[PDB]
Amino acid sequence: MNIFEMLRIDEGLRLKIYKDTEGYYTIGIGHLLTKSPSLNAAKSELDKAIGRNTNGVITKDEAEKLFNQDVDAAVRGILRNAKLKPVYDSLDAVRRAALINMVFQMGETGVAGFTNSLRMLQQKRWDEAAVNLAKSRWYNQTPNRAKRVITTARTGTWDAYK
Ligand SMILES: [Cl-]
Ligand SMILES: [Cl-]
Ligand SMILES: [Kr]
Ligand SMILES: [Kr]
Ligand SMILES: [Kr]
Numbered sequence: 001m002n003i004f005e006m007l008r009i010d011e012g013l014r015l016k017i018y019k020d021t022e023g024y025y026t027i028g029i030g031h032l033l034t035k036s037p038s039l040n041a042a043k044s045e046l047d048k049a050i051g052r053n054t055n056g057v058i059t060k061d062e063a064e065k066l067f068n069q070d071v072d073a074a075v076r077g078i079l080r081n082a083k084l085k086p087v088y089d090s091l092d093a094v095r096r097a098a099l100i101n102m103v104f105q106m107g108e109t110g111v112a113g114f115t116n117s118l119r120m121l122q123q124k125r126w127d128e129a130a131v132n133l134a135k136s137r138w139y140n141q142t143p144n145r146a147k148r149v150i151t152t153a154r155t156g157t158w159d160a161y162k
Contacts, residue, residue, distance in 0.1 A: 001161050001162075002097070003071060003097045003100050003101070004067070004071065005161075006097055006101060006158075006161055007029065007030065007067075007071070007101055007104055008029055008067075009161060010030075010101065010105075010148065010149075011030030012029070013028065013029055013063060014026075014027065015027075015028070015057055015058055015059070015063065016056060017033070017039070017042055017043070017046065017056045017057075021141065021142055025039065025042035025045075027046060027056075027058060027063070027066075028058060028062075028063030028064075028066050029063055029066070029067040029070075030067075030070070030104070030105075031049075031063075031066045031070055033046055033049070039056075042056075043055075043056055046058070049066060050062055050066075070104065071100070074100050074103045074104040075100060077103060077107075077108040078099065078100065078103055078108065081108050083112045083115075084099070084103070084108065084111065084112055084118075086122065087099065087118050087122045090124075091121070092156050094152060094158065095152070095153050097152065098150075098152040099111070099153070101149050101152075102138075102149060105138075105145075106138065114133065114136070116132050117129050117133045120132060126153070126154045126155070126156075127154065129153060129154065130150050130151075130153065130154040133146075133150050133153070134146070147160070148160035148161060
């Protein structure tokens with residue numbers, strides 16, 4: 001398992017514009033297009049990201065291309081975030097994957113806000129981090145996914161994804 005397979009599991013793959021769990025226009029593997037209510041606007045953002053008039057539908061390849069870009073961007077956001085980087089650097093490879101998934105899902109800013117779990121993680125206090133992480137809107141709104149990511153961070157193994 002790796003970060004790509006992991007997020008491909010959590011986000012799925014859809015070739016036509018769809019709305020995510022919050023109601024936002026998204027396409028591919030969890031690629032948000034806009035927070036706006038407008039399909040037209042979503043469509044504009046999509047053709048802009050793809051480089052052609054998609055009419056709201058893309059190919060697998062194009063979807064994987066956006067995904068590659070988004071993963072990369074998630075890593076680079078972590079590395080540039082002064083509150084995120086040190087946690088990330090302290091972690092083993094599997095746990096790092098968990099942090100990349102959260103950031104992909106909620107953005108840098110959002111995750112940087114989990115001050116307390118960040119610190120427990122940094123301290124390698126796994127069970128404690130796990131309990132804190134679950135006290136969040138994130139967990140109450142997308143509990144199945146949150147649970148898989150939280151077990152990943154807690155245990156350092158991919159068991160939740162097998
Ligand atoms: Cl883009
Ligand atoms: Cl769920
Ligand atoms: Kr994490
Ligand atoms: Kr976190
Ligand atoms: Kr954790």
